[PDB]
Amino acid sequence: EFVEIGGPSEKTFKQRRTFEQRVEDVRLIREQHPTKIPVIIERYKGEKQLPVLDKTKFLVPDHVNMSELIKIIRRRLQLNANQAFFLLVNGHSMVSVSTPISEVYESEKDEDGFLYMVYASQETF
Protein backbone atom coordinates (compact mmCIF):
# COMPACT_ATOMS: atom_id res chain seq x y z
CA GLU A 1 0.00 0.00 0.00
CA PHE A 2 2.92 2.23 -0.82
CA VAL A 3 1.92 5.10 -3.11
CA GLU A 4 4.39 6.13 -5.81
CA ILE A 5 4.66 9.92 -5.44
CA GLY A 6 6.49 10.27 -8.73
CA GLY A 7 8.06 13.70 -9.25
CA PRO A 8 8.96 15.44 -12.50
CA SER A 9 10.81 13.71 -15.30
CA GLU A 10 14.59 14.40 -14.80
CA LYS A 11 15.70 16.80 -17.56
CA THR A 12 18.70 15.69 -19.63
CA PHE A 13 21.86 17.77 -19.87
CA LYS A 14 20.97 18.64 -23.45
CA GLN A 15 17.58 19.81 -22.19
CA ARG A 16 19.19 21.93 -19.41
CA ARG A 17 21.81 23.78 -21.52
CA THR A 18 21.74 25.37 -24.96
CA PHE A 19 24.02 24.24 -27.78
CA GLU A 20 25.95 27.54 -27.54
CA GLN A 21 26.54 27.13 -23.76
CA ARG A 22 27.75 23.52 -24.02
CA VAL A 23 30.22 24.32 -26.81
CA GLU A 24 31.66 27.13 -24.73
CA ASP A 25 31.62 24.81 -21.72
CA VAL A 26 33.93 22.50 -23.72
CA ARG A 27 36.11 25.29 -25.11
CA LEU A 28 36.83 26.41 -21.47
CA ILE A 29 37.41 22.94 -20.09
CA ARG A 30 39.91 22.14 -22.88
CA GLU A 31 42.21 25.19 -22.46
CA GLN A 32 41.97 24.82 -18.68
CA HIS A 33 42.46 21.05 -18.56
CA PRO A 34 43.98 19.78 -21.81
CA THR A 35 44.62 16.29 -20.45
CA LYS A 36 41.01 15.65 -19.28
CA ILE A 37 38.11 14.43 -21.49
CA PRO A 38 34.69 16.10 -20.89
CA VAL A 39 31.99 13.47 -20.56
CA ILE A 40 28.25 13.63 -19.75
CA ILE A 41 27.12 10.47 -17.84
CA GLU A 42 23.46 9.82 -17.27
CA ARG A 43 21.26 7.00 -16.06
CA TYR A 44 18.87 5.42 -18.57
CA LYS A 45 15.34 7.08 -18.43
CA GLY A 46 13.68 3.67 -17.64
CA GLU A 47 16.34 2.36 -15.27
CA LYS A 48 14.82 0.23 -12.49
CA GLN A 49 17.84 -1.35 -10.75
CA LEU A 50 20.78 1.10 -10.74
CA PRO A 51 21.15 4.18 -8.56
CA VAL A 52 21.32 7.73 -9.76
CA LEU A 53 24.73 9.24 -9.90
CA ASP A 54 25.52 12.23 -7.74
CA LYS A 55 26.61 14.47 -10.66
CA THR A 56 26.46 14.63 -14.46
CA LYS A 57 29.37 16.64 -15.90
CA PHE A 58 32.70 14.81 -15.66
CA LEU A 59 36.37 15.31 -16.48
CA VAL A 60 38.06 11.97 -17.29
CA PRO A 61 41.85 11.50 -17.50
CA ASP A 62 42.95 10.99 -21.11
CA HIS A 63 44.85 7.85 -20.06
CA VAL A 64 41.85 5.91 -18.85
CA ASN A 65 40.53 3.14 -21.07
CA MET A 66 36.80 2.37 -21.44
CA SER A 67 36.97 -0.66 -19.38
CA GLU A 68 38.63 1.16 -16.46
CA LEU A 69 36.04 3.91 -16.89
CA ILE A 70 33.29 1.40 -16.41
CA LYS A 71 34.75 0.22 -13.08
CA ILE A 72 35.23 3.82 -11.86
CA ILE A 73 31.50 4.46 -12.50
CA ARG A 74 30.44 1.29 -10.75
CA ARG A 75 32.74 2.18 -7.89
CA ARG A 76 31.27 5.69 -7.65
CA LEU A 77 27.75 4.15 -7.80
CA GLN A 78 28.75 1.82 -4.93
CA LEU A 79 27.64 -1.34 -6.78
CA ASN A 80 27.83 -5.06 -5.87
CA ALA A 81 30.47 -6.62 -7.99
CA ASN A 82 27.68 -8.95 -9.12
CA GLN A 83 25.15 -6.29 -10.33
CA ALA A 84 24.50 -5.93 -14.09
CA PHE A 85 25.85 -2.72 -15.61
CA PHE A 86 26.49 -1.41 -19.18
CA LEU A 87 27.78 1.87 -20.46
CA LEU A 88 26.63 3.10 -23.88
CA VAL A 89 27.98 5.60 -26.32
CA ASN A 90 25.99 6.39 -29.51
CA GLY A 91 24.02 3.13 -29.10
CA HIS A 92 27.12 0.93 -28.74
CA SER A 93 28.04 -0.91 -25.56
CA MET A 94 31.48 -0.44 -23.96
CA VAL A 95 32.00 -4.04 -22.64
CA SER A 96 33.98 -4.81 -25.81
CA VAL A 97 36.43 -1.93 -25.64
CA SER A 98 39.82 -1.32 -24.02
CA THR A 99 40.72 1.54 -26.29
CA PRO A 100 41.88 4.84 -24.63
CA ILE A 101 39.26 7.46 -23.94
CA SER A 102 41.04 10.10 -26.00
CA GLU A 103 40.40 7.78 -28.93
CA VAL A 104 36.68 7.27 -28.10
CA TYR A 105 36.34 11.03 -27.59
CA GLU A 106 37.50 11.85 -31.12
CA SER A 107 35.34 9.22 -32.77
CA GLU A 108 32.10 9.65 -30.76
CA LYS A 109 31.86 13.11 -29.23
CA ASP A 110 28.82 15.15 -30.01
CA GLU A 111 28.89 18.25 -32.11
CA ASP A 112 28.86 20.36 -28.93
CA GLY A 113 32.17 18.63 -27.98
CA PHE A 114 30.90 16.59 -24.99
CA LEU A 115 31.07 12.77 -25.11
CA TYR A 116 27.68 11.38 -24.04
CA MET A 117 27.05 8.20 -22.11
CA VAL A 118 24.18 6.41 -20.58
CA TYR A 119 24.43 3.55 -18.11
CA ALA A 120 21.87 0.83 -17.55
CA SER A 121 21.34 -2.67 -16.10
CA GLN A 122 20.39 -3.81 -19.69
CA GLU A 123 22.50 -3.81 -22.89
CA THR A 124 19.74 -3.60 -25.55
CA PHE A 125 16.22 -2.04 -25.43
Contact 38, 55 (CB under 8 A): no
Question: What distance in Å separates the CA atoms of residue 92 and residue 1, rounded to the nearest whole number?
Answer: 40
Question: What distance in Å separates the CA atoms of residue 13 and residue 53, rounded to the nearest whole number?
Answer: 13
The resolution, in angstroms to one decimal, equals 2.5
Closest by Cα among 41, 34, 29 to 62: 34
Question: What distance in Å separates the CA atoms of residue 89 and residue 87, rounded to the nearest whole number?
Answer: 7
Q: How is the chain split into domains, by residue range?
A: 1-125
Which residues are within 8 A (CB) of 63 and not within 5 positions of it... i.e. 6 or more apart?
Answer: 100, 101
- The domain defined by 1-125 folds into Ubiquitin-like (UB roll) (3.10.20)
Question: What distance in Å separates the CA atoms of residue 38 and residue 34, rounded to the nearest whole number?
Answer: 10
